Structure 1
Amino acid sequence: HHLVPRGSNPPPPETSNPNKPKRQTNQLQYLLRVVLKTLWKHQFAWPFQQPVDAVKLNLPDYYKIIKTPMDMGTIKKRLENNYYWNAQECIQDFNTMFTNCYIYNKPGDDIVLMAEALEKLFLQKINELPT
């Protein structure tokens, strides 16, 4: 088809675990209802709300470089489906999302500023987690 590499996309990350028993917790609830909701509405959130489309965003080699993709849409779905055992698993996924941005992009890029601002807010919000 193409004369320059355009890339391709993996299926989005899994968002449910059919073997996992349900275990609801206060911190997981707070993560879904307060932390993620606050992050989602931040002015710089939109690029992180859905999986990277390597083809449409013209980032052909994105999924060569990023072996563990992550986005806020996926994190939201994982919280909704009770995929996470604890807050730390969720936090790890946020960390994977931000660090993927830092890995793929150059330190001076606009997208990295946006990720850094979101990460700073995230770190503030996780200090609110209930006992």
Structure 2
Amino acid sequence: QLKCCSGILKEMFAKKHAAYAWPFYKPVDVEALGLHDYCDIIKHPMDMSTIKSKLEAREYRDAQEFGADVRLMFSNCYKYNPPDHEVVAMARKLQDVFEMRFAKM
């Protein structure tokens, strides 16, 4: 399962999806973007590079704990932004990729 989790990350990082996945590669840079309310709204920030480091450090007991951090990442985007924001559309497109792969394991 955890080997299947590494492949899920490889797909989400792949060039085919980079046009909408790139905001989720790294932690939201609140200081550079002026998002000084982000920490008040988002209790648990999460991104793909942090997920990758947690995976390699064996911080996930199983694929469901891995999947929870991926979905936390999307849920943070859906919570913080207005629904018509372009970043929300990008999160949904990347969630499409993740959910189709996660379903196959």
Identity %: 45
Rounded to whole Å, the distance in 1 between the matches of 2:71 and 2:103 is 15
TM-score by length of 1: 0.75
Q: Which residue of 2 aligns with 1:60?
A: 36
Largest Rg, 1 or 2: 1
User: What does 1:18-57 correspond to in 2, within 5 Å?
Assistant: 27-32=1-6, 34-41=7-14, 42-43=17-18, 44-57=20-33
Letter in 2 for 1:84: Y
> Could you give the per-residue CA deviations for residues 40-63 of structure 1, whole angstroms, max 9, x where no partner exists?
122211110111111101211111
CA distance in 1, matches of 2:27, 2:40: 15
CA–CA distance in 1 between the matches of 2:75 and 2:9? 17
Tell me the equivalent position of 1:7: none
Please give the TM-score of this superposition, normalised by the length of structure 2.
0.93
Residue 127 of structure 1, CA deviation: 1.5
Count of equivalent residues: 102
Inter-partner Cα distance in structure 2 for 1:79 and 1:29? 10
Structure 2: distance between partners of 1:67 and 1:81:
23
- Higher helix content, 1 or 2: 2
Report the Cα distance in structure 1 between the residues aligned to 2:83 and 2:28, rounded to whole angstroms: 18
* Separation in structure 2 between the aligned mates of residue 97 and residue 77 of structure 1, nearest angstrom: 15
One-letter amino acid of the counterpart of residue 74, structure 1: T
Shift in Å, 1:126: 0.5
Which consecutive segments of 4 or more residues in structure 1 shift more than 3 A? none
- Structure 2: unaligned runs, 5 residues or longer: none
- Aligned partner of 2:77 in structure 1 is 101
